[PDB]
C-alpha cells in the first residue's frame with residue numbers, strides 16, 4: 577500500500593538529477609532502474625564527460641549549458657565525490673570546412689563567451705602534443721571542462737535518498753497504465769502508482785515508448801572510447817592539455833587529457849554500430865573499427881598519445897532524426913514527462929534537465945525555454961499507434 581508523488585523510470589543521467597531536484601523539495605519520489613546507477617549498461621559510464629558552453633550543435637543550447645554548469649558547481653560543494661575539473665575545451669578543424677567549428681565560434685560570439693581564437697602552428701605551439709595542418713583553425717573555451725559522470729549520478733543518488741527519495745534497483749519497468757489523475761508502472765517486483773511520471777530510460781526509450789502510445793524514431797548506437805598510454809609531459813591534465821571535440825575530413829572526434837596517468841581518452845563520434853540496447857556487445861575490440869578508428873586519429877593529430885591501449889568502454893547514443901533532444905510532456909498525458917533522444921551530447925545538460933523535468937512534473941511548465949525539444953515537432957517524424 578505505497579503510492580508516491582512522482583515516479584522516475586530510469587534513474588540515470590536525467591532521471592537521477594530529476595530525483596535529486598524533487599527530493600530537495602520534499603516531493604515523495606520513487607526512482608526505478610533496471611540496474612544499479614551508476615552502472616556500465618547505459619549511456620553514462622566511461623568515467624568522464626565533456627561540458628562545453630559555446631554550443632556547436634546550436635546556440636539555443638547555451639542558456640541550459642550555463643545553468644547546468646552552475647548546478648555542477650553546486651553539486652561539487654554538496655558531495656565528497658569529485659564532480660568537475662576545468663580542463664577547458666579545444667575545438668578545431670579545417671578552416672572554412674567545418675560547420676561545427678563555425679557554429680561554435682558564432683555561439684561564443686553571440687553569447688559573449690570567453691574564448692581564444694588561434695590557428696595553424698599557434699595550436700601546435702600552445703599545446704605540445706597536438707599536430708594539425710597549417711590550414712586548421714581553432715577556438716578554445718577555457719572555462720568549460722570535464723565532468724565525472726559516474727560521480728555525478730552517484731552523488732545525486734546519495735543526496736536524493738538522504739532526503740527521502742526511494743530507489744528500486746535491478747527492477748525493469750515493463751508497462752505503463754496512465755489515467756488522467758494518476759500514473760502506474762508494472763515491474764516483476766510489483767506495480768507502483770503516483771500522481772506524476774517521468775520517463776528517462778535512455779537507449780531503452782526506443783523500445784518502451786511504444787507502451788505509452790508514442791511512435792517516435794529513436795536509434796541506439798554503439799559508441800566506444802579508448803584510453804591510451806601517453807606522453808604525460810604533454811597530455812596530462814596537470815600540464816593543461818585540454819578536453820577536445822574536433823572535426824576532420826572523416827568526421828568528429830572527442831577526447832580528454834590524461835588524469836592521474838589514466839592515459840588520454842579518445843572517441844569517434846561520427847560513426848557507430850546501430851544496435852539494440854538488449855543485445856549490444858559491450859566488449860571493446862570485438863569490431864576492428866573500435867581500436868583502428870581511434871589510432872588513425874592519434875597517429876595524425878596526437879602522435880605522443882598513441883601508445884598501448886590501457887582501457888576501453890562501450891556506451892550508447894540514442895539519436896533523433898534532427899539530433900536535438902526530447903524534453904516535453906506526453907501529448908495525451910500532462911501528468912507524464914518524457915526525456916529522450918539525447919543523441920550523444922546530453923550528459924553535460926543532465927543537471928539542468930533534472931531541474932526542467934522536476935518543474936514539468938510538478939507544474940506542467942518550466943522556467944527554461946525548451947521549445948526546440950518539443951515532442952510534437954515535425955523534424956522528429958513522430959506519431960502514435
Ligand SMILES: *Cc1cc2c(cc1C)nc1c(=O)[nH]c(=O)nc-1n2C[C@H](O)[C@H](O)[C@H](O)COP(=O)(O)OP(=O)(O)OC[C@H]1O[C@@H](n2cnc3c(N)ncnc32)[C@H](O)[C@@H]1O
Nearest residue numbers: 586588589590610618619626749778891892918922923924
Ligand atoms: C555513450 C557515450 C555518450 C556520451 C559520451 C561518450 C560516450 C561513449 N560523451 C559525452 C560527453 O562528453 N558530453 C555530453 O554532454 N554527453 C556525452 N555523451 C552522451 C550522454 O552520456 C548521454 O546523452 C546521457 O548519459 C543520456 O542520459 P539518459 O539518462 O538518457 O541515459 P542513461 O544515463 O543511460 O539512463 C537511462 C537509465 O534508465 C534505465 N532503464 C532502461 N530501461 C529501463 C526499464 N525498462 N525500467 C527501468 N529503468 C530502465 C537504465 O538502467 C539507465 O540507468
Ligand SMILES: O=C([O-])c1ccc[nH]1
Nearest residue numbers: 626627830920921922
Ligand atoms: O557532447 C559532447 O561533448 C560529446 C562528446 C562525445 C559525445 N558527446
Ligand SMILES: [Cl-]
Nearest residue numbers: 893894918920
Ligand atoms: Cl545519448
